[model samples]
Target: WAQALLPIWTYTQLTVSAPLFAALVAAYGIYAVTRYGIKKARTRNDSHQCANNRGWCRKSCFGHEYIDWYYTDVCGSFYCCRPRNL
Candidate 1:
């Protein structure tokens, strides 16, 4: 006879892990594709378009305040940067 090197998880480790991994990958793939679609859709919005055309801050701007703050539907929001001097 031969020996087997394996892992564990409750009992039927292989079966449980196979399904679990599949579910994780499936969910993540769907979520990623959905987000990409949403981003594309949101890019069509005037708000995002204007902000991106100008100066869009994906995160907070460096300056203490912003001249304009655009409210986005899909991207949460982005800052229209104002320089530190301004």
Candidate 2:
């Protein structure tokens, strides 16, 4: 049958035990998640900075969590600053 048909399949063999394989997989998963989070955080920070520079909103400019939509347009287009809560 197929077994005696001069089998010429994958020549390269990767020898890895079950436990080692599981550990490697788990470690890779953790690394992927952590790296994703770090990249997202960095992008968020950059976005906040760009918004501030373009006079979009002063929400993340002064290290505030809430946005002051009322005073967004008060500062005009050149320089936009809003009143944030403490």
Using lDDT as the measure, which candidate wins? 1
- Candidate 2 lDDT score at position 1: 42
Kindly provide the TM-score of model 1 when superposed on the true structure, using C-alpha atoms. 0.24
lDDT of 2 by residue, 27-86 (tens): 555343222111211232222221433223323434432343444555433223322321
- Which pairs clash in the backbone of model 1? none
What lDDT tens digits, residue by residue, belong to model 1 across residues 1-86?
02111211111112123344445345554342222112312231243322333333334443343444553333456544433322
RMSD of each: 17.9, 20.9
Off by over 4 Å in 2: 1-59, 62-64, 78-85
Give the CA lDDT, 0 to 100, for residue 54 in model 2: 26
lDDT of 2 at 16: 29
Deviation from native of the Cα of residue 27 in model 1, angstroms:
51
Q: Each prediction's TM-score against the native?
A: 0.24, 0.19
Residue 26 of model 2 has an lDDT of 58
